[PDB]
Design a protein around this ligand. Structure first.
Ligand SMILES: Nc1nc2c(ncn2[C@@H]2O[C@H](COP(=O)(O)OP(=O)(O)NP(=O)(O)O)[C@@H](O)[C@H]2O)c(=O)[nH]1
Ligand SMILES: [Mg+2]
Ligand SMILES: [Zn+2]
Lengths: 147, 421, 97, 295, 135, 49
RNA sequence: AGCACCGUGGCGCAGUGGAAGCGCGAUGGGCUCAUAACCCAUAGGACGUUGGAUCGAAACCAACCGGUGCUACCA
């Protein structure tokens, strides 16, 4: 179909952030990967078409007319893309603060690294092309004899 | 035997028994110590002889073990025979919160100590500072400051640290004591360290005044001995001598002696007469004990108690020599302004000491004693308290006392005192 | 005095909390390691009233005076014993998550 | 050594055939109605099951389905299975051609404890009298009938084990051979009955001395106390030393384990009294925990 | 900041969780199989085994996540990771009774102790069946 | 598909021996990816975009 | 350092002299629209090691080794 991954535009609202716990009446509690503590909401195209769990990472928006009102979840990042994001160069895995930075909660927590793609297979596509219009030897039984 | 007693102070997690492990090559245990993990709990002792390495000042590399360095009779570092200079004992005084009182117990024995700080923590913790003021009661002159970890973090943070510490010291205690790098679970830069210990002078002591000994250890009975003569392989008054020559087959009096209960409200304690069976220090056996060094004076008579040390602050002398036993001591006390050992944010933000008042739990650390006291009188003359001690104390000097109070399930130095008596 | 002090500030008194799961997303929780002197009826009956729960005052052989609760609570079964001299902050096992 | 040799040899065999697996323990062919018995489980067969007794030969018996327990079980298999040895009692009994009918569901609130004990005693009696009998000649039937069977008849239901008209008498004390008849097999009987059994295992507390208190003479006093502690004695074992655990400085733990009876209790009490009253005047006083146990 | 294989999961039967990468993980911090397995299974207070093709099985049910990591963190900061430097190259020893562990990248020795839980587990949670089996 | 097979049960009622009959037993999930089965082209373009 | 207890299938254990079993497992089938639940068939044992007692045992005795608990704290 289409892309499963988008990047924040720093202008026009939109900043990465992580869910903490969940609260009633469609709202939840939400915390900033630089700033202090927040409360979020959700949009009505995700009211039960999409479920945003706790400690899932998402992309907010912010109000244009007035800051420091409330913010809203306008997207979700699938776990597949979270590991990728966090790797590259981008967001902290500790979500600066955590609850708070002055209590330094949840210490390392040493890196995990998705270094598990290659298993030591999948080496060499640099080899032969077809040989056709040649008589060549190639009888089986090979190895079968060492005498 | 050892001639000079060298202690160890420093907050826990900065090394204590670690530096000792480097040099001596031995460790201390009691079983309980393992179960709580990296708490030392009671006191260290070990012995390492000094013999000068004769082309050594600071050569680049050698084996990590200290046997190429002193505590050997041959040298491979200079490749030449060795020659005696000195011999030392070690003592390890705790750095954990609770263990203040037992640091105090072992604080009047020593003739010097090493402060230990590490680069992995903040500038001056609370417990470090409290150690220092504790010292100044008993008024040691020689002191040495060290950085235990310098190779576990960079050679940048090291420098800073050193500058700060350097500033702070010689603005508290003069002599401008040196601040020195070492390693001692990698066991390097001993040569450096050792050179500074060599220069620390002979202290003076009296060898012809009536006997005085300070006990801090007891129990050596068995397990085995099991068969034959049957049990055990009688006990000890394992401690230091300050005065006189403790020879074998002398007659000794224990001057706190056996404690007897109150008969209504007044208690009595009767001395214990005992004989020296043998003097044992290190793995060697002595025929006479010279002041300085930990000598295991072999005791005699009856069983019961003195399991690990129930000889806490006990004084041994010769027959017909009696340090005066006092049940009541008139203490002239001076308090500090800061309740050291408090941990809140930073050491410098500390709370201030509350005045000494009637009817409060004290302690009273008279030398090696840990006697419980209650204030009954603040009046006799201003700033004098007539304090009644349940556990009797023997005066041989005017006595230099550190006073400890409970702050929150643990005592924290509050002041110092001197007995008028 | 000091003896008792140590023997208490550095020995025994170790405070167990644990969480498990009954099914799907239902959960359960316990506490153990609290001294016999304290009334269990008064602590349990507090936890309950401060949030839809369900206590007990179970006594089990060689583990006794052990109390459990209904729901996942780990955080608040630690928090409430911190400020209140019930756990020297050193004896706090969590087996949750 | 023909003993060693016989063993190693007979791992390669070809086995020596022996009576371990058959022959009725008592006279009777079959029990009376409502008698507990000790059976073995040959199989299940869905509709009830076929088991065998062991107290009387290998003779069958068959429990009927819906007669194993009160509870729903669904599967019969996973309560009882096969190869077990279990209790059961009787309901009906045909002596005409030997059908017997049993229940496991009427054996309730133990009772099957008695069954264990009973069975075991039986097994002892039997395995004994064969090793006797077949060193010389004669089949087991006859030797049995002349040694085993009398003591089940003479005194009613006292077995050939317990009360002191039976066999374990003749392990303590002798003189009961007389009213029975017995050639050479008397020898082999009594001597196998010794060679195997065993009594077994008994208490072994360890005196505890707490020599609390003081006095211008403790150690010396403690030594004197210690010297009378153990040997002492010796005599044939049980003994009473070694002695051998240091606990604390006042507390000394002396062993004292017996292999034979309550007789160790007397020795410990006497030793403690001598040490405490006559001695312990030169040192502290002797106190007991007590003292015995460990257990 | 070391690199640890990111445990990876499967939801089979909507009860069990199979962990494929088990074998690889245990190798990495240089500790054996059975001992590591014990700690995990004790904390969660579930059954399941290993065996197989060295993929673990557990009766613990969770919504599929990367949140298995918390468990591993506990194990690694108790057992393997020295409190001198912060670094795993570490190697277990047998010293005295209930004494173990050594560091070797600066050789500051450290002891630790091993779980043998058995204090309180509650009860969960069907009955009838329990008594039936314990018949 | 299994979830579609779990929504075909049949039926309620506590007990039929000692154990329970319940349908549904809760699920509020929910789906991940939606893999999207990539091969229009992959590698070369990625160094420009 | 002694005392006490324990050592049996991958793991936890049963088995007081006629002497290889059970529960959890692994692997492969069957029941079910699927999954739990539940049946069945397979392979998997120096009964810690050594000596001794015994017609004969894995079971009893001794020696050593390992594991765990308790008391010991070692000039
Ligand atoms: N890398 C490194 N490790 C060190 C250094 N000094 C000590 N350690 C480590 O720190 C640990 C603590 O040793 P220890 O001396 O018991 O600390 P302590 O401060 O004496 N304990 P206590 O506070 O109770 O006296 C030891 O395992 C040792 O390996 C150092 O300079 N570098
Ligand atoms: Mg230490
Ligand atoms: Zn390290």
């Amino acid at each position: 179909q289409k892309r499963d991954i988008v990047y924040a535009d720093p202008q026009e609202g939109e900043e990465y952030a992580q869910v903490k716990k969940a609260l009633g009446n469609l709202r939840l509690e939400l915390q900033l990967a630089d700033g202090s503590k927040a409360i979020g909401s959700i949009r009505g195209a995700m009211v039960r078409k999409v479920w945003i769990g706790q400690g899932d990472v998402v992309l907010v928006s912010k109000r244009s007319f007035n800051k420091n009102d409330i913010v809203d979840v306008i997207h979700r990042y699938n776990p597949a893309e979270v590991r990728a994001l966090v790797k590259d160069e981008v967001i902290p895995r500790d979500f600066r603060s955590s609850d708070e930075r002055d209590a330094k909660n949840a210490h390392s927590d040493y890196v995990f690294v998705a270094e598990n793609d290659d298993d030591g297979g999948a080496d060499d596509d640099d080899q032969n092309v077809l040989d056709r219009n040649k008589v060549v030897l190639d009888d089986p039984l090979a190895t079968f004899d060492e005498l | 035997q050892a001639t000079v007693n060298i202690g160890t102070i420093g907050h826990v997690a900065h090394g204590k028994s670690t530096v000792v492990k480097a040099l001596s090559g031995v460790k201390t245990q009691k079983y309980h110590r393992e179960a709580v993990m990296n708490i030392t709990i009671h006191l260290g002792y070990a012995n390492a002889k000094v013999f000068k390495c004769d082309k050594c000042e600071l050569p680049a590399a050698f084996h990590a073990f200290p046997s190429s360095q002193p505590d050997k009779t041959d040298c491979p570092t200079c490749g030449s025979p060795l020659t005696l200079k000195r011999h030392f004992s070690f003592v390890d005084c705790p750095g954990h919160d609770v263990l203040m009182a037992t640091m105090l117990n072992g604080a009047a024995i020593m003739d010097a100590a090493l402060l230990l700080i590490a680069a992995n923590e903040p500038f001056p913790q609370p417990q470090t500072l409290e150690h220092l003021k504790a010292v100044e009661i008993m008024r040691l002159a020689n002191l040495v400051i060290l950085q235990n970890k310098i190779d576990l973090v960079g050679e940048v943070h090291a420098q800073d640290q050193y500058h700060k510490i350097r500033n702070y010291i010689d603005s508290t205690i003069g002599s401008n004591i040196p601040i020195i790098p070492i390693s001692a679970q990698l066991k390097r830069n001993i040569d450096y360290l050792l050179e500074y210990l060599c220069h620390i002078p002979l202290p003076t002591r009296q060898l012809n005044c009536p006997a005085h000994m300070t006990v801090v250890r007891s129990f050596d009975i068995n397990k085995p001995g099991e068969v034959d003569i049957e049990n055990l392989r009688g006990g000890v008054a394992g401690g230091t001598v300050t005065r006189g020559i403790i020879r074998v087959n002398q007659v000794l009096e224990i001057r706190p002696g056996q404690v007897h209960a109150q008969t209504g409200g007044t208690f009595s304690c009767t001395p214990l007469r005992t004989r020296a069976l043998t003097l044992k220090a290190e793995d060697n056996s002595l025929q006479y004990a010279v002041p300085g060094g930990l000598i295991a004076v072999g005791t005699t008579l009856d069983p019961t108690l003195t399991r690990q040390d129930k000889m806490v602050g006990h004084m041994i002398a010769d027959e017909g020599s009696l340090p005066e036993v006092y049940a009541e001591i008139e203490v002239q006390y001076f308090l500090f302004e800061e309740m050291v050992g408090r941990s809140k944010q930073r050491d410098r933000n500390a709370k201030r000491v509350q005045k000494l008042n009637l009817q409060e739990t004290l302690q009273i650390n008279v030398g090696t004693l840990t006697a419980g006291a209650t204030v009954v009188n603040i009046t006799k003359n201003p700033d004098i308290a007539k304090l009644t001690l349940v556990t009797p104390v023997c005066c041989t000097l005017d006595e230099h006392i550190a006073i400890s109070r409970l702050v929150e399930k643990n005592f924290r130095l509050i002041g110092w005192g001197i007995i008028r008596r | 005095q000091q003896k008792r002090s140590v023997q208490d500030a550095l020995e025994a008194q170790k405070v167990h909390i644990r969480v498990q799961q009954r099914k799907g997303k239902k959960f359960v929780t316990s506490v153990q390691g609290l001294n016999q002197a304290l009334n269990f009826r008064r602590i349990s009956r507090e936890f309950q009233r401060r949030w839809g729960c369900n206590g007990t005052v179970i006594v089990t052989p060689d583990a006794g005076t052990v109390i459990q609760l209904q729901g996942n609570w780990s955080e608040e079964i630690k928090k409430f014993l911190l400020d209140e001299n019930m756990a020297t902050e050193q004896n706090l096992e969590i087996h949750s998550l | 050594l023909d003993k060693r040799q016989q063993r190693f040899l007979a791992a390669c065999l070809g086995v020596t055939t022996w009576d371990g697996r058959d022959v009725c323990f008592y006279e009777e062919k079959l029990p009376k109605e409502n008698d507990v018995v000790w059976v073995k489980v040959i199989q299940v067969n869905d509709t009830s099951a076929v088991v065998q007794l062991l107290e009387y030969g290998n003779h069958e018996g068959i429990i009927p389905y819906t007669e194993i327990t009160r509870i729903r079980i669904r599967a019969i298999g996973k309560v009882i299975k096969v190869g077990r040895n279990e209790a059961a009692q009787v309901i009906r009994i045909d002596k005409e051609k030997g059908y017997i009918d049993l229940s496991k569901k009427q054996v309730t609130l133990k009772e099957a404890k008695e069954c264990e004990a009973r069975f075991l005693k039986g097994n002892e009696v039997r395995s004994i009298v064969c090793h006797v009998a077949d060193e010389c000649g004669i089949p087991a039937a006859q030797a049995m009938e002349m040694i085993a069977y009398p003591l089940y008849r003479r005194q009613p239901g006292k077995h050939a084990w317990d009360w002191l008209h039976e066999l374990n008498r003749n392990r303590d004390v002798e003189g009961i051979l007389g009213p029975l008849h017995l050639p050479e097999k008397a020898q082999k009987l009594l001597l196998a009955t010794l060679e195997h059994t065993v009594r077994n295992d008994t208490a072994t507390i360890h005196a505890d001395i707490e020599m609390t208190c003081f006095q211008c003479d403790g150690v010396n006093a403690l030594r004197d106390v210690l010297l009378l502690g153990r040997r002492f004695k010796a005599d044939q074992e049980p003994q009473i030393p070694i002695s051998v655990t240091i606990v604390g400085p006042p507390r000394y733990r002396l062993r004292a384990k017996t292999e034979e009876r309550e007789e160790g209790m007397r020795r410990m009490r006497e030793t403690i009294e001598t040490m405490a009253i006559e001695i312990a005047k030169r040192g502290g006083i002797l106190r007991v925990v007590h003292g015995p146990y460990a257990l | 900041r070391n690199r640890l294989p990111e445990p990876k999961l499967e939801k089979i039967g909507k009860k069990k969780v199979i962990i494929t990468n088990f074998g690889r993980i245990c190798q990495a911090f240089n500790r054996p199989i059975q001992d590591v397995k014990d700690y995990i299974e004790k904390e969660l207070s579930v059954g399941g085994n290993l065996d197989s093709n060295d993929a673990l099985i557990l009766k613990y049910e969770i919504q599929k996540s990367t949140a298995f990591d918390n468990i591993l963190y506990k194990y690694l900061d108790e057992f393997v990771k020295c409190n001198s430097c912060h670094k795993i190259d570490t190697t277990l020893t047998k010293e005295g009774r209930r004494m173990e562990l050594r560091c070797n990248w600066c050789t500051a020795t450290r002891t630790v102790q091993a779980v043998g839980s058995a204090t309180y587990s509650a009860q969960v949670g069907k009955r009838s069946k329990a008594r039936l089996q314990a018949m | 598909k299994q979830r579609e097979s779990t929504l075909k049960q049949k039926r309620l009622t506590t007990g039929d021996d000692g154990d329970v009959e319940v349908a549904d037993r809760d699920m509020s999930d929910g789906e991940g990816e939606d893999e999207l089965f990539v091969v229009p082209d992959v590698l070369p373009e990625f160094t420009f975009i």
